[PDB]
Amino acid sequence: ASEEEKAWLMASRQQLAKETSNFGFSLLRKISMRHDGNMVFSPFGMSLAMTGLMLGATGPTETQIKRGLHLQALKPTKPGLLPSLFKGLRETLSRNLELGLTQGSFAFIHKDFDVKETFFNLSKRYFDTECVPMNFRNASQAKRLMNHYINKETRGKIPKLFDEINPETKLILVDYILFKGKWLTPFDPVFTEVDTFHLDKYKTIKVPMMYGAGKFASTFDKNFRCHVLKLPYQGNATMLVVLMEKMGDHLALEDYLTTDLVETWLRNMKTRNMEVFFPKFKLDQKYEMHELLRQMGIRRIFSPFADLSELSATGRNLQVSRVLQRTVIEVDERGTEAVAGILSEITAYSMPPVIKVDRPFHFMIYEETSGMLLFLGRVVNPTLL
């Protein structure tokens, strides 16, 4: 790249992160209309995957995607600088051996359509989306083959992504992402015990509860009445845990979740020696994203009126049929061998501060340099997926 172009790229990193987290919070509010329970997806993975579809789209088909992802304010000198933004960021996530992240995407395209190699190579090289021709007319075979590809790339952790295939299918976009991190200060499994968890004010369940002692950053929003706790990972990533005060509605906060709100929390953080009680959990969630994306203004591409003619010249009638994301997140005690910090003594009038996550909570996993929101989630019951 040129001098001014390299300038544009790094300058646009913050802006891309901010917009993608607002895209994320908007998509969260859509998902919440259909689901009350456990919830996790990846704003980054979705934006990466959908931005890949712009390579083939022209006109409103393309423009709506760009607006829907909150990316319209980015004006690059060359169109290809936006994909290079995504290429740089995902490669840095990859290079982090310390970060236990697995991510990828597929574009399963009906065999009628002659996929141009420009799209084919650029989608792989920039977004690592693999275009794979498929015969959907033989639906049961397409199901087995597609599931094979995802099986391979996830090393068996997602063995059968697909349950059903419409033989009328034109294009299916799949984004998968799996993560289990290592904490910067680990929990001691000797102190992990079965504690009560309030599914709600009238319903309790027993769950494994991890115990952590040392220096942690946190803050308390006096307006919304919620605690925000930073749990840093190895590999330059952090989980923010958002815990509403006891008589409050965790679901209610989602309407106010903005990039700006999170930033206000982050700069009001104070670090102190304290105790953290936090449940072990695993989430595995898949969503049909295309209808949710429609409600965020990404419409033409999921219609017969889509223009992906650049993606392939062959006709009748190239649109996207489905867009899937499946997200797997696991949390346990494991971390790097940090030395344990000293808590303050227990006196007659006080003991160390404590945040006890024994009721439903939200979490956000951020990459630290960029601020990119890799995971946005909600745990209402840690004993199920």
């Binding site: 259909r34 009238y202 008589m247």
Partner: protein
């Protein structure tokens, strides 16, 4: 230490578990008693009190004098209605007949607060709060209906107790209603029921009521708002009613109505 939904010997209104005990709390304008369980009316605007039309029911009236929607009082100086209703006319006047015939109380609406996540297309979050120029004189001029906390509504009121759908004739009329789960209701109404709406079975078509009508439920001598009636599917002729799930808007109520 746990809040027992199966029993009647615990809190009267709301409950909160933890420790090895449970802290009871009350609805709007009620004092927590000496026994830490009962809720006694304290303020003049003690919510949800009936006697022997309805203290909380109001009509929305336009500049020409035409009534177009219904609404329910939820605070001394605030009425809740649908967003569609609040956006139909620029100058809206709330009116009530409670404790008045040819002389209803008129009150001008100084501000309109459409929900921040209202979307006309999808029909999500179709509510608005209307601030009154002058507060209602409780209890003689009127009374607000209680707004329940989330879990209380969704585990104690709606699934267990029979409800009352009350409002103004579309062209006060009250009928009992009961809960129908989303899977069934979606197929009857040919829609997808969201987490912020739910369905009531009705012995009469939905078009019987005006937009802005409400479902209420009694509990230990107090009436709680659980639903608001807005845009009905399939013409509003079906014997099920799709209402907005009020229990999910408690934070919005506070954020707006506390200024």
């Amino acid at each position: 230490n746990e809040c027992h939904p199966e029993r009647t010997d615990g809190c009267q209104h709301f409950c909160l578990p933890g420790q090895e005990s449970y802290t009871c709390s009350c609805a709007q304008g009620y004092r927590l008693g000496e026994d830490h369980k009962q809720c006694v009316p304290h303020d003049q605007c003690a919510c949800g009190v009936l006697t022997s039309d309805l203290p909380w029911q109001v009509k929305l009236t336009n500049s020409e004098g035409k009534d177009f929607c219904g609404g329910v009082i939820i605070r001394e100086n605030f009425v809740l209605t649908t967003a569609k209703c609040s956006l139909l006319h620029r100058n809206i006047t709330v009116k009530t007949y409670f404790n008045r015939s040819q002389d209803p109380l008129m009150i001008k609406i100084t501000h309109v607060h459409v929900h921040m996540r209202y979307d006309a297309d999808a029909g999500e979050n179709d509510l608005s709060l209307l601030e009154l120029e002058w507060p209602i004189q409780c209890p003689g001029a009127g009374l607000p209906v209680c707004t329940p906390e989330k879990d209380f509504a969704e585990h104690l009121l709606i699934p267990r107790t029979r409800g009352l759908l009350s409002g103004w004739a579309r062209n006060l009329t009250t009928r009992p209603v009961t809960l129908v789960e989303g899977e069934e209701c979606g197929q009857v109404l040919n829609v997808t029921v969201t987490t912020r709406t739910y369905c009531e079975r009705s012995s009469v078509a939905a078009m019987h009521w005006m937009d802005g009508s409400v479902v209420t439920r009694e509990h230990r001598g107090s009436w709680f708002l659980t639903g608001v009636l807005g845009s009905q599917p399939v013409g509003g002729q079906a014997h099920m009613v799709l209402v907005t799930k009020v229990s999910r808007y408690s934070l919005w109520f506070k954020q707006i109505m506390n200024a």
